[PDB]
Amino acid sequence: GSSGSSGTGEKPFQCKECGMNFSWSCSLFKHLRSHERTDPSGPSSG
């Protein structure tokens, strides 16, 4: 299976719609709207 982690990169904030991560806090919100206005057309992320 997927066995290979090249480099390390974690994130404090994360999207609860698609999983998109964002360094800042507010930033995420600016992206979250993408779901508040338009629908992803179903569960994009498991």
Ligand SMILES: [Zn+2]
């Ligand atoms: Zn998202």
